[PDB]
Amino acid sequence: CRQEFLERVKANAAKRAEAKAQGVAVQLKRQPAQPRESRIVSTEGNVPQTLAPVP
Amino acid sequence: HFKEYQVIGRRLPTESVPEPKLFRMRIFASNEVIAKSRYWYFLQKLHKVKKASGEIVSINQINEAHPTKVKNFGVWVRYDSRSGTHNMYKEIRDVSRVAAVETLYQDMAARHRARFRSIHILKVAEIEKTADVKRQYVKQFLTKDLKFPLPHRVQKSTKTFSYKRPSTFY
Amino acid sequence: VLKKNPLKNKQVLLRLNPYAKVFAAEKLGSKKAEKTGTKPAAVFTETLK
Amino acid sequence: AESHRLYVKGKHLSYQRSKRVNNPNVSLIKIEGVATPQDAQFYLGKRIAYVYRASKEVRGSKIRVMWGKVTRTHGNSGVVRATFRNNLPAKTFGASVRIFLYPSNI
Amino acid sequence: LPHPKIVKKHTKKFKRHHSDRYHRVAENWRKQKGIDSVVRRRFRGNISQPKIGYGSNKKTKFLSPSGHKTFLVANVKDLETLTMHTKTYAAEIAHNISAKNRVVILARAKALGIKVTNPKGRLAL
Amino acid sequence: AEQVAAERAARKAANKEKRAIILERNAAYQKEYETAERNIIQAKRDAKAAGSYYVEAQHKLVFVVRIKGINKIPPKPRKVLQLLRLTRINSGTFVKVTKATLELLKLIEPYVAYGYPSYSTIRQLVYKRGFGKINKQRVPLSDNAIIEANLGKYGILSIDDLIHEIITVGPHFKQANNFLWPFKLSNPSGGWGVPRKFKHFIQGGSFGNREEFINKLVKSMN
RNA sequence: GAAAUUGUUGAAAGGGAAGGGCAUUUGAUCAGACA
RNA sequence: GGAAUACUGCCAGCUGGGACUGAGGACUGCGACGUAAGUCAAGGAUGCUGGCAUAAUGGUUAUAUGCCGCCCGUCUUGAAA
RNA sequence: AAGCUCGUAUCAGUUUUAUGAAUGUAAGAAUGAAGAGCUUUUAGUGGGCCAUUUUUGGUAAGC
């Protein structure tokens, strides 16, 4: 049930040691799944192929 | 009133499968949001995908090429009914594709009691050459020098009382 | 003692947001932009039709 | 000569109401020659007077008046709402009510 | 004295339910204790009840139309209390004061400039 | 006694200095928004010129307006509406979009109309219906010192810094959003458009995601 | 010397109920301010 | 090829008409304009003008009119009855 | 209702992530709230009818 908590606290112990041993912006908190960032997707080989209920 | 939309989707790019096949189709709707929703609804039926598995890459308004030339359209329609779904081919004479599908949706509701959620527009095509126009009610208007009157016209009153006894001449 | 709305009553609009004077002066909402000639490619046009 | 009219004749139709609750504070007035909401926009703010006739001579007249202003257009036919100083008697549903030409924006 | 315009909220009297039907039921207000009363459950078209929303404006509470608080007065020594407060309070000569003493109080109140709400009380000629 | 005009004049000098800081910040935010939207436009044009497709960056901010009454609501969504501070009908709040918040929106879809706000709507919402939670006590904004006194802890020092933290969903979004008392909107000026409000927006109703027409909707409600 | 209940006089209303609430016309009647 | 325009969105663009509201009561604050003094639409209405000064306000009251409005109390029951 | 603590990190008919054979835990995830715990004691209360969704049985049909 709490199998992840002890492991992530051990990861918090690894990231606290890494925090002290570096000029740090810490971020040990888990952030939820963000909205998707912008990307330019190219259609050079992979052509935008049409479909329809032909059927 | 309608609007035609090119809507594309390519089931979200993950590991080991980069750049999928980009599934493109033309969607008649009233606005962009409805077009998007209709596209996902069609994708779930054409193959086994979901709304969360993909992404709308491009939504674009397809304006009509020559909105001044009267065309002879033939629309392949299928729709869910009181019984099982079935194909239908109706021929429509109109100026634009948006206006022709508009007249179809109102006619489908009028003669078959099918709302917007039932109708699957398959293919709207121009019939280029006449005498290949199949339906007789459309071929009715393709005769040489068609001169027909509009007998018995109503005169729209602005008041309640008239002083003439109206003349429905034309 | 009473809530003066901005948007209307330009005086309280200038009480908050001191830039409102500069925004109105340069117009900055009706601001024109320079045009380019980046024509869409053959692929985009053919797949649109 | 015959015409001395400096106002537009109109009819007090009803009170502002639902099916079951009438609001006596707001009276609906049909102005003659007005058929749209757009035409009645000229008539907002103008002083209406219901001129009735009472047998007892109060202050040197057997003629009595109730004042009020046209407030806002009501519906799609040019019938306009009206608020009077003292409300209209409810017996006056279908009575002639005088829409004056002041205050003018002309 | 400068006062706001007086808004009463409820000019009418809060009469008891069925006080106009029966003669044995007084017009004096009582709350309908019964659970199946349509007055208690405040139905459409039933009599309005006293509730704290009808409370008069604090700046214009207890004031007569003239913007004066009425103050009952029996004699000169009690009238002499409102020497300083002439535009706040106005005198009210008590109902039981004789016609002999009312003329004393009225003359004295004219001298100090304290307003009497009820002259013409026992002032027949 | 002294101090009658001396401390007053020094206070006026401090007021002028603080105001000037706000001015150059506002100019910086104005230029930021303008160049941002120009970048979206030009990247779209360049994508078409390359024969490519430009996806936009997914929206990170929604405005949620309650559409339904307090009654005949299941508890599963009724708790959610209290958590989004949508206590009465037509009450509106800003929501940061995550995986955690999007499913909260999916539970309450028949009861709210939400979408993605523009800068113009947020500017008009905060300028007109702007109210702060100062210990409690729904305080009207009206003065920049009122914003700075509470949110100077988190950088924010004026009304437009607060709007900036709302739209450009920042490091201190939670504090600016929770500071803002839930907006109390009127019923829409032009009407709802639809005959029946309780169908999904896609099928001729009001509720659910409308994505962009929330700007048309909320500006009439404002 | 109350009310129930009744007579007379004056006003008013009344086409298979009445009394009650909101609002006003009409008739009746009344309060100040101008001390 | 070179334009216009629709639709959509923004303006801390301008300019009219209409309605309801004026709460507070020496001064403090935040501002705007001004070369400064001073002014202001900036911490909630003032300025000007007219009729009446009593039944003209308004109230109480009898009635008319539009709309609403089961007969209270008890006792049952999940309710009405 | 009364007293004594902390007015707080005391939590929530909610979502997420992870652990699991629409329910179970944990969180240095989200969002929401300043009404939290502990004694002492003091009123009233101890029926149900209707409908929606799961699910097991049923039949001319209801159920």
Cβ within 8 Å, pair F202-B116? no
Q: Which residues of F touch A48 (CB under 8 A)?
A: 53
> What is the tally of structural domains in chain F?
1
> What distances in angstroms separate CA F10 from CA A19, C18, F3, one per listed residue?
45, 20, 10
Judged by CB atoms within 8 Å, which residues 20-49 of C form the interface with A? 43, 47
Note down the domain range covering D32. Answer: 1-106
Q: Letter for the amino acid at E13?
A: K
Residue B78 belongs to a domain: yes
Cβ(F182)–Cβ(F138) below 8 Å: no
Give the whole-angstrom CA distance, residue B22 versus residue A51: 10
Whether residue B72 sits in one domain with residue B135: yes
For residue A51, give the nearest of B24, B57, B120 by CB distance. B24
Q: Which domain holds residue F117?
A: 1-222
* Phi and psi at residue F161, to the nearest 5°: -65, -35
Q: What is the stated resolution of the deposited model, in angstroms? A: 3.3
Query: What one-character DSSP code corresponds to residue F199?
Result: S
Q: Residue D87: give its domain's CATH number.
A: 2.40.10.190
Query: Whose CA is nearest the C1' atom of nucleotide I12?
Result: F79
Residue F193: exposure state from Cβ atoms within 10 A (0-12, 13-18, ≥19): middle
Nearest residue on chain C to A51, judged by CA atoms? C47
Residue with tokens 């809530």: C3
Q: Tell me, yes or no, whether B104 lies in a domain.
A: yes
Method by which the model was determined: cryo-EM
Distance CA F148, CA F158 (A): 6
What contacts B97, CB < 8 A, 6 or more positions away? B4, B64, B73, B124
Q: Where in the sequence is the domain holding B95, given as residue range(s)?
A: 68-144
How many residues are recorded in chain B?
170
Bond prior to E4 in cis (omega within 30° of 0): no
Secondary structure element (H or E) that encloses residue D23, with its range: strand D22-31
Distance CA E90, CA E79 (A): 10
- Beta bridge partners, D99, equal D8, D48
The strand G neighbours among D residues 17-76, by Cβ under 7 Å, are 24-25, 52, 54-56, 58, 64, 66
For residue F121, the one-letter residue type is T
Asked if residue C4 lies in contact with residue F126, where contact means CB atoms within 8 angstroms, the answer is: no
Nearest to F91 by CA among F192, F197, F191, F180: F180
Count: domains in chain B: 2
Give the β-pairing of E69-73 and D95-100.
unpaired
Q: Is the peptide bond before D103 cis (omega within 30 degrees of 0)?
A: yes
Strands F112-115 and F208-211: parallel
Q: Are residues B138 and B73 in the same domain?
A: yes
User: Domains in chain D: how many in total?
Assistant: 1
